[PDB]
Amino acid sequence: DPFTARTQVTRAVSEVSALKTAAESAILEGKEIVSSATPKDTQYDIGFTESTLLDGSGKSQIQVTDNQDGTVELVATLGKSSGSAIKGAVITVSRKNDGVWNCKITKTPTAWKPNYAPANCPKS
């Protein structure tokens, strides 16, 4: 039902967006941002725990790009327990080198409804 779908999207957005704090810490420490079970000493894992709403397994559920100059992208895809009306949507939480983050949802499936995306992470 729609309320469950809306709850699931908002929770998944929160799970990815929660990682920004660890990402900022890595930037302060001058260490490369990763989502990895085997980070090197010059890398900083962002502390993600596997979500039952995302496609993939473990820390690989979050795909990280970090140019090590303040431009960062955290990408996840709805899946596993997510309902058919949201499965496949992509959540992208990105940082620009001015320090500003934004959240966008793309690739929404056919039964996506307009209010499934929260105001803090609109559908592009």
From Swiss-Prot:
Organism listed in the record: Pseudomonas aeruginosa
Descriptive protein name: Fimbrial protein
Localisation per UniProt entry: Fimbrium; Membrane
List of glycosylated residues: 124
Membrane topology qualifier: Single-pass membrane protein
Disulfide pattern: 103-121
Subunit structure: The pili are polar flexible filaments of about 5.4 nanometers diameter and 2.5 micrometers average length; they consist of only a single polypeptide chain arranged in a helical configuration of five subunits per turn in the assembled pilus.
Keyword Transmembrane found: yes
CC per GO annotation: membrane; pilus; type II protein secretion system complex
Residues of the full protein shown: 34 to 154 of 154
Gene from which this protein is expressed: pilA
GO BP term, example: cell adhesion
Sequence similarity: Belongs to the N-Me-Phe pilin family.
Modifications after synthesis and translation: O-glycosylated; glycan consists of 5NbetaOHC47NFmPse(alpha2-4)Xyl(beta1-3)FucNAc in beta1-O linkage to Ser.
Keywords carried by this UniProt record: Disulfide bond, Fimbrium, Glycoprotein, Membrane, Methylation, Transmembrane, Transmembrane helix
